[PDB]
């Protein structure tokens, strides 16, 4: 059962100060290897709001940043420090689990 | 002779191919297929009497049995005979791929 | 091409496989008796004794109304020639003693299993006359469950067990034939054909046209037209692409059996098409049905030309046949 | 796969061959047959769930659609796969003869 | 229908029903006639020694037992007495399938 993920590149949306959002990605695909998991990155800045969802190896880093919580089965937005713009990252190992982004279960 | 044209032209109570739309995500759960999001998978349906498109000899024998024995529950069933592959477009990673899923669309129905 | 009488060189032979007994009688008067009696009176021809096949392949089965047969049976295997009976039993019970009173100088090659463990064979001197043999059998064992006089064939199917629809006492008649006790004969029927002069190719197109499949005037029912595809020699094996164009206006059920041949096989016929068991499928058989196939020697060549099943290797028209044989040489 | 051996060996609610006695004179109306007076023409019957002997890709697609849409009335049917001839004896004039009526006995069933 | 007739085709065989209005041929052989032109024929012979019943697929044009057929179109085998000296002789012919199976001498009860 190969894992399914959204493989859209950097896009623009209106997800800011919201409890949940949708990736709005029209591409659903099988990653190259079943070991890979879906990873979502949020890097909003003063220029514009940016987000991305791709496949990535759980043990490999993205942009020289280690995804320590890649083993989680659900994509939970966790803050990561980065110069220039704030970093938010999540990863998930089930099928098509990066379609919807959940910032926090608090409601 | 029970092709798509014959059954789609007018109503036919006996074994015929009937139009049916299959949406992958909603119907089959195949969330791995990007294009097409749905297609037409017609289905065969309709009782088979003696005077109809029976293919083999066993079908004719069973039809005769049912004709001489109404309450028997044994009769040939309307089943696919001509199948056409469905063109699909699916992504692996960032790579698009065009495939022809073999035997996905029903074009003709027989009685067996 | 030109249609001419075919010879051994023609790639398709048009044998006819028929089941017949010269005479016989089946009697139910052995239910009371402890042992069933099956008597076979074989007949030979005037041909050379050396040319006569010394081997017989007596098949034993239970009748359709009996799942397994558990009852002592005595088989009287009478023939005016010394024979070896290659028995082949199916669905017969184990441990029940059985007797085979064969003619003098005849040996029975029982198959392996429990059957050969409780089978006694005795060579005797049965008379070469139907009435005398039946009288001897009746005197020795009361009543015969079955008697059949038949020509010496390669295969002789016998279905044991008493059927109560049979007459109480045996009465031999020429016009009697029950599907239990019969023989299997292959008669090479004459037919026309022609072979197109072609260079050796991996693609072969054989067109087979059949006029009359069976002698019954009720030809609304399918008949099995068994096609044998075997090489000229088993070793070395041959891998090829066969395109069998089969045509018969009357309804038939062309059955394709291939042995010791590899490759890709396609069959095109307006009637039904079938294949044998997994032991009978030596090639990647794929069936193809087209009701547009014509029914003449001329039109069929044009049909092959139009449909791309070219070049046409061989053509064979058989007025009456049902056991086509296909010999491929190399 | 679903041959007579397995179906007669153990009762199965799914698509399987079931014993049936086709009586020539009484049922088929064929008075021209002298022997056998009636034979065993097993008939295929039984629903086809997705976890079963599904042969074609369209069969799997229809099974999935039926599973995810129970109120559809469209599903693969139980039909013969391998059929075996029946040897009969009939009289022409005063001469009996043996014919092999092909495709009359069902040996195995399939879902399609 | 151009299909050949179905007729009982037992040769001369002994029966038990004598002089009765109706009887069954009790012939275990039902045969498709050799030629499509043929029709079913039944011949009942009665002697002081033994009684016999014969059934055949016979051409209506050709006379059987030197006797011409005048009822080939009959749906059922209307048995008719003939004038064979000495022995009692009845013959009938019909064209329905297995029509010679049932023999009727008189329709009256």
Residue numbers in the entry:
A (entry chain D): 10 to 116
B (entry chain A), D (entry chain B): 1 to 112
C (entry chain C): 4 to 333
E (entry chain E): 8 to 116
What does the published report state?
BG is nonetheless essential in vivo, where it binds and potentiates the activity of the three TGF-β isoforms (TGF-β1, -β2 and -β3) by presenting them to their signaling receptors, TGF-β receptor type I (TGFBR1) and TGF-β receptor type II (TGFBR2)4. BG, and a homologous co-receptor of the TGF-β family known as endoglin (ENG) which potentiates the function of BMP9 and BMP10, are transmembrane proteins with a large (approximately 760 amino acids) extracellular region comprised of two domains: the membrane-distal orphan domain and the juxtamembrane zona pellucida (ZP) domain19,20.
To decipher the direct potentiation mechanism, we analyzed the TGF-β1:BGO:(TGFBR2)2 complex by Cryo-EM where zfBGO was replaced with ratBGO. The strong preferential orientation observed previously was overcome using graphene oxide grids enabling building of a model into the 3.40 Å resolution Cryo-EM map. To test our model, we swapped the shortened loop from zfBGO into ratBGO. Despite similar binding affinity for TGF-β2, potentiation of TGFBR2 binding was not detected, showing that the extension in the binding loop is essential for potentiation. In the structure of the TGF-β2:ratBGO:(TGFBR2)2 complex, Y248 is predicted to be responsible for most of the contact with TGFBR2 residues F10, P11, L13 and I39. Indeed, mutation of ratBGO Y248A nearly eliminated the potentiation effect, in accordance with our model. The structural and biophysical binding data demonstrate that the binding loop (BL) of ratBGO is not only the main structural element required for binding to the TGF-βs but also potentiates the binding of TGFBR2 through direct co-receptor–receptor contact. The potentiation is mediated by expanding the binding interface and increasing the affinity, not through allostery.
